[PDB]
């Protein structure tokens, strides 16, 4: 009568090494350029 | 309806149906006190673990009957490790017959072969361990019996 010690059929076997982990984000982002600036509602030559 | 004890076993899905003057609400509550109730343990592998349905029409008793009249009622079908610890008796009975080889004639005799009974107890005995792997649903603990020193 001893059946051997017979194993299961048919498990999660597939997600043994499973969790699963997660990516990333960073956003994060650029500056613009404001450089090209000048006034222009005053005198420069004509104070003078 | 089936002989074994669900608090031996462990719920794993529960389809509920419900029945005549039924609120949507009042199901809910009802369903969200089962399962805070945890006692009622549900596999952890499955925590939505509820399907319902709702229909207008009460049941109706044929007339000779025992069972009470009521404006609502309700029906579930669940899955539990109960019912397969249930069928690990009746392969237990099976076993004992076949350790004696009783009754196999009136079965080999319509042409069958004794190798189909040491098949079936085998693929029987790999459902046990089947369930046996989803009863182990590693459910995380809760602390312990005791303190400590310092």
């Known amino acids: ?48 | 309806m089936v002989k074994c004890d669900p608090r031996h076993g462990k719920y794993m899905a529960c389809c509920l149906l419900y029945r005549g003057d039924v609120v949507p609400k009042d199901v809910n509550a009802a369903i969200a006190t089962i399962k805070t109730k945890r006692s009622i343990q549900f596999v952890d592998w499955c925590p939505t673990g509820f399907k319902v349905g709702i229909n207008y029409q009460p049941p109706t008793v044929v007339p000779g009957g025992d069972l009470a009249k009521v404006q609502r009622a309700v029906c579930m079908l669940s899955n539990t490790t109960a019912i397969a610890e249930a069928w690990a008796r009746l392969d237990h009975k099976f076993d004992l017959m076949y350790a004696k080889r009783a009754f196999v004639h009136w079965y080999v005799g319509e042409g069958m072969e004794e190798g189909e009974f040491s098949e079936a107890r085998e693929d029987m005995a790999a459902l046990e361990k089947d369930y046996e792997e989803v009863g182990v649903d590693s459910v995380e603990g809760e602390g312990e019996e005791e303190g400590e020193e310092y």
Request: glycine residues 10%; aromatic residues 0%.
């Open chain 1, 1 to 48: 009568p001893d059946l051997k010690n017979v194993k299961s059929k048919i498990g999660s076997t597939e997600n043994l090494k499973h969790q699963p982990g997660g990516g990333k984000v960073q956003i994060i982002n650029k500056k613009l350029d404001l450089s090209n600036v000048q006034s222009k509602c005053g005198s420069k030559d004509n104070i003078k």
